[PDB]
Design an enzyme around this catalytic site. Sequence first.
Site, mmCIF file in Angstrom:
data_model
loop_
_atom_site.group_PDB
_atom_site.id
_atom_site.type_symbol
_atom_site.label_atom_id
_atom_site.label_comp_id
_atom_site.label_asym_id
_atom_site.label_seq_id
_atom_site.Cartn_x
_atom_site.Cartn_y
_atom_site.Cartn_z
ATOM 1 N N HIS A 16 0.849 -1.190 0.000
ATOM 2 C CA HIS A 16 0.000 0.000 0.000
ATOM 3 C C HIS A 16 0.878 1.230 0.000
ATOM 4 C CE1 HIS A 16 -3.376 2.602 1.478
ATOM 5 N NE2 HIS A 16 -2.375 3.234 2.054
ATOM 6 N N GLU A 17 1.864 1.215 0.861
ATOM 7 C CA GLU A 17 2.736 2.375 0.990
ATOM 8 C C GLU A 17 3.732 2.544 -0.149
ATOM 9 O OE1 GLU A 17 1.352 4.041 3.445
ATOM 10 O OE2 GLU A 17 2.584 5.770 3.054
ATOM 11 N N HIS A 26 1.768 4.218 -2.866
ATOM 12 C CA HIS A 26 1.793 5.666 -2.879
ATOM 13 C C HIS A 26 2.915 6.305 -3.707
ATOM 14 C CE1 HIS A 26 -1.574 6.447 -0.423
ATOM 15 N NE2 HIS A 26 -1.038 5.983 0.694
#
Length: 891
Positions: free
Chosen positions: A656-657, A660
């Site tokens: 998820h990170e 980004h």
Amino acid sequence: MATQEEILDAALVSGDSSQLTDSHLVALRLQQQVERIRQTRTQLLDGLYQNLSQAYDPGAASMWVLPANPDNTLPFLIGDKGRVLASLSLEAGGRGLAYGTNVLTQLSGTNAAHAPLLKRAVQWLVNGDPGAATAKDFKVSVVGVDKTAALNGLKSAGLQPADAACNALTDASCASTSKLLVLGNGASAASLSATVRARLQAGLPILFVHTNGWNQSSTGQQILAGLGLQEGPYGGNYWDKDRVPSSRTRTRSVELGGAYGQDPALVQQIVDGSWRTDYDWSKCTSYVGRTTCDDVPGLSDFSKRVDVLKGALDAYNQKAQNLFALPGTTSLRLWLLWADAVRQNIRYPMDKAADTARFQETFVADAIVGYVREAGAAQKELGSYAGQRQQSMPVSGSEETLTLTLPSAQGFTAIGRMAAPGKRLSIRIEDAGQASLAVGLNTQRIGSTRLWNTRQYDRPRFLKSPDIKLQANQSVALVSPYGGLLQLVYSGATPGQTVTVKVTGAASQPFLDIQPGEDSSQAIADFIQALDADKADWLEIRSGSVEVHAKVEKVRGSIDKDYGGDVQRFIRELNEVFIDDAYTLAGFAIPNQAKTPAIQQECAARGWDCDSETLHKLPGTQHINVDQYAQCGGGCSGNPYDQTWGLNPRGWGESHELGHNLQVNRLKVYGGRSGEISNQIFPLHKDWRVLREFGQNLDDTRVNYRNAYNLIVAGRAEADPLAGVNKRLWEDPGTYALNGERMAFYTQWVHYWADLKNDPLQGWDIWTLLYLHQRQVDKSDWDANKAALGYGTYAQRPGNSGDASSTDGNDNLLLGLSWLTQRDQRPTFALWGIRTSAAAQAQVAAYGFAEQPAFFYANNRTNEYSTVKLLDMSQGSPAWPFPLEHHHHHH
Ligand SMILES: [Zn+2]
């Protein structure tokens, strides 16, 4: 053998604080020295000012001029807003004075009142005594500012100078006969800083006036550096318009100038141990487990004073200056040795209420670290940062040579060696091209020292050093009290270039350096062997565009927990399931990895460039910190992003990170509304892959197909069916609002593409294709490529807005998806409440495709696609076609 007194005296010469432990002793000496300086300053300023007018107004069109070394430089004029408008220098045993504007041409105007004080300042320059008259016709050389106007200014102040009629800046014989040199920013000279310094050292007094108003000046900066002073920041006096009023008194100016950049109250506090016993800690607040204390009365003022000291020392660190090799730096030397001495005594953990004295004194010492030196001391206890292994790491006696690749123009990259605590390291860089470089130690963000949490002051506040500037081919010697992971910090680089790093005296942490597109099995075995020896507290991994900076025990914990101790399998998954999965999903040009056959073919069928570095080079490094604490929470966004649990190749958060970092505005629905959505393709793809490739079912309820459907069916019943769905799905601005429902839009296209290709394994190619398409849309030559990109109707490249009110993302999604599927997708966009611009709608109409009637792919699991069902939404809305897994519905 040696007494502390004797150790201190020798340490003051060499910087070698190895055996220095008595902090109180050092602190007494610092107190005497700070008092010497205040006495010397106050006698000089009092002699300058007497009872003359203090009025001085340099106007908005002027610059601040600051001191640097407090032992030899000091303010002359400090405004009511505390801005230093002029400063005095005794650097190199000379006499200099510098003003932030050309006060010499204002001595019959705005600053007529200053003229008598200026005369005393000139007397001090010429004679060393502010009350000693100058001789009639004393010879003045004026260089870089109007000579006649300057000389007339001096005359109007009641001096009788004569033109030296030679240049005392550039001519050393002229200097020897001249009584004063006046400089402005029009000056010409070779090696301007060193030349100014040479003249100063030889005993020529210098008066500098800034001649460019509120503008900065390189010539000005170089002259000031020669005087040991500092040009103020951008904008000068433009906003503050600071000035010294007529009401200013002798006593007050003497006090302000005597106190500037000094903290005798702090030194007394240290000497006496009079640390504050009654801070009101009840005013601290906590945010997802991190305590901060910004509103505790008194604390910010104290912390800001400590920041002054840190900033003053770090200015030397940053320029790679060794305070112990610079003459007349005694105050600063004493601060540095005092703090090294505190470091012999630090013990952890400390608490802000239980240990007020040790806590506050450490708070100060931690702020004061001198890195650039030939010897120094290790901190005895490294607490939650490191321990006995870091302390004992062996170092190389010989020089090691390392070749590093810079993946982008700006950032930092692991060098692959450490400083050992208290051990001299020497470093330099070669073959830098045009890249600007520095060395740094460690990567911790400052929130990861949780000193305001109960009993968690258990490591240094500032584990990451300042960036220490390096010059091509010049060695710098460092000693750190902590040890650290060496980083090469870079800007203005050419993506793909290399730099050569030569280092002596460094230790070798376990370091896994995957070589792009090459076989890695030896590197892995060497890394595993290094881990096995267990001689380090920190390790690093460089794999593609990811660098991991990690506490060993945390990584060991993840391998032991989820990989049964199998370090090979952990590494393989980190490289493949985590890292490569993401970069490959986003379609980057990965060394020695071809695109898959289906992507290859679709790119040829579209006639696209899907492989050049120009368009698809890997992005700059994403760093990951793995540590006992994080900047915020138990893990925190950024670059580096921080986490404390370990490092899980199969983790949702990790992908998820990383996601980004890989987001692009032209693939976001409603800008910020997809700010936590469009990155979700990375962990979703990874989970789809993990369930197939390993049989492990993770995060299987993330994609809320069922509720997305409810919201669509309810919304589309409205008078404006698109607005009705928009209101229900995309309008809420909350950070993770409708996260599961919005994700279901992104997966629609995966299920659609799989069907369109008639291959259940190809679905996710649509996102790789959209990524490929978007980077062409973003950077390809417009007129020449727009037809191939399905943007034939656009006179110019579309916008890249990330705003929620923009259609830039919706439009490109609509076009990319229609163009790649070769169907008009407007009806499914409308189904989902997603509006697009007239331009985009016209472009889709231009393609002349058959509409794809509104459709919806439904599932009751996220990861298992074999059960997905395709609903025709074109005539109505069928009933939701699933029960809930392992659920007893109501009869
Ligand atoms: Zn996020």
